[PDB]
Design a protein around this ligand. Structure first.
Ligand SMILES: *CCCCCNC(=O)[C@H](C)N
Ligand SMILES: [Cl-]
Length: 437
């Protein structure tokens, strides 16, 4: 139904408000891609995309305002497959669906050229009142290799949902190629997920969480302006370099993402001398079965306050992270932006985003591996990891361009990785004694 006014999630309200401060800006454009190791049929994949979008409410939506100016979400189905119509018979715009095909096979540096293309696209503003807030391109790179680019407005798609989209696209593609019925879209309902958030705000737990978070930061100013689209520098680490993180996880008993967060806390402590370190951690903000399967934007960012005292081993820092994360998860439903609103002023540190495992995407032979292009805007620094210690990592340092140049990030990144690796190689060692020239 086209006249129904859908409620925004908390995260979507937050993005909406931020967008109004810079109406024509592109700072909330984000993107990812799949590096695909075998040939795909663009014509079939284009059909697959239309069908994928048609069953993904968030990729069919536009944002409008009531008379008070308050936003709501409106659903705009695409036109039927084959149809060229732009509006339905009642004047409701159809969500356009376009899969660009960019053949770079005869190019000197297909990869580099595709990256420059994605960066140009990420700098393109998408007005929120026009349905279909995404941008798609299939690159042909020669040798039967492809790149699928998914560019979005952050208000419609979070990191979790990117994986949901890629899984669904491939599933649809496989069916179309096999000539099977396309399996039914098994996505959840955004309205129910929003209703869940509303129930939480109305519940006692909200006040408990509020007390908890205000309690922890009643007193600290963030240490290194507006949030801007980052300059992104990316570093590939093969398994030979990353396996050590897995060994550190095994030995400390902590998940490897915690080892990385401990690593960042250690790095900040050594770089700046502060014992009161803060890093921000994204959580998915998805609670319950329906929410876990609803493409959309519900992610939350929460500050992690970590005491790093002199003489401590790296294993002790991992425990500090563990202790702090336990509190954060137990009160995870409280919105980071509401915590900031309460405290006033500017609380945050570098975002440390260790993305969860995503199985390689299967197109029926060809296999797609996901990599981040830009995860979101930043006042300072996002650290984004994709991969696993066993399979290798991609490490992205995403820096506010007023704060960092590309070269600053490369140097920072290289120093951090070498420091993390040596910490991980011996968690018993005192952090302060670990040589970092
Ligand atoms: C005001 C909206 C919430 C913050 C936006 N979230 C992100 O940028 C995530 C970390 N990619
Ligand atoms: Cl996200």
């Amino acid at each position: 139904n086209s006249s129904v006014r859908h409620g925004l999630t908390s995260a979507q309200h937050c993005v909406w408000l931020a967008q109004q401060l810079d109406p024509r800006g592109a700072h909330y454009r984000t993107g990812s891609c799949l590096e695909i190791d075998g040939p795909l049929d663009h014509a079939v994949l284009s059909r697959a995309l239309r069908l994928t979008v048609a069953g993904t409410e968030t990729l069919c939506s536009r944002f409008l305002t009531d008379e008070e100016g308050r936003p709501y979400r409106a659903y705009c189905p695409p036109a039927p497959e084959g149809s060229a119509a732009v509006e339905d018979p009642d004047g409701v715009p159809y969500t356009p669906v376009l899969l660009r095909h960019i053949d770079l096979s005869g190019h000197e540096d297909p990869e580099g050229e595709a990256q420059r293309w994605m960066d140009r696209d990420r700098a393109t503003p998408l007005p929120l009142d026009r349905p279909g807030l995404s941008s798609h391109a299939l690159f042909t790179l020669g040798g039967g290799r492809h790149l699928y680019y998914l560019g979005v407005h952050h208000i419609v798609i979070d990191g979790t949902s990117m994986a949901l989209f890629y899984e669904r696209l491939a599933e649809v593609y496989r069916a179309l190629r096999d000539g099977r019925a396309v399996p039914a879209a098994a996505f959840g309902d955004t309205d129910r997920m929003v209703a869940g958030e509303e129930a939480y705000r109305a519940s006692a737990r909200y006040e408990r969480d509020r007390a908890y978070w205000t309690g922890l930061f009643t007193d600290p100013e963030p240490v290194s302006g507006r949030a801007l689209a980052p300059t992104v520098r990316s570093l590939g680490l093969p398994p030979e370099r990353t396996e050590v993180l897995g060994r550190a996880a095994e030995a400390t008993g902590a998940h490897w993402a915690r080892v990385v967060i401990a690593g960042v806390a250690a790095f900040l402590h050594r770089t700046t001398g502060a014992r009161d370190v803060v890093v921000s951690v994204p959580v998915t903000g998805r609670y319950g079965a329906n929410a876990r399967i609803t493409p959309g934007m519900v992610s939350n960012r929460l500050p992690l306050r970590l005491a790093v005292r002199p003489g401590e081993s790296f294993a002790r820092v991992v425990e500090t992270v563990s202790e702090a994360m336990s509190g954060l998860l137990a009160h995870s439903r409280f919105r980071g932006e509401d915590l900031d609103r309460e405290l006033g002023g500017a609380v945050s540190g570098p975002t440390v985003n260790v993305m969860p495992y995503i199985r390689p995407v299967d197109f029926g032979g060809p296999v797609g591996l996901m990599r981040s292009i830009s995860s979101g805007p930043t006042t300072d620094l996002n650290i984004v990891l994709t991969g696993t210690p066993e399979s290798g990592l991609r490490v992205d340092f995403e820096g506010n361009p007023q704060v960092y140049g590309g070269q600053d990030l490369t140097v920072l990144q290289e120093r951090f990785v070498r420091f993390l690796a040596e910490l991980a190689a011996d968690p018993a060692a005192t952090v302060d004694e670990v040589a970092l020239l």
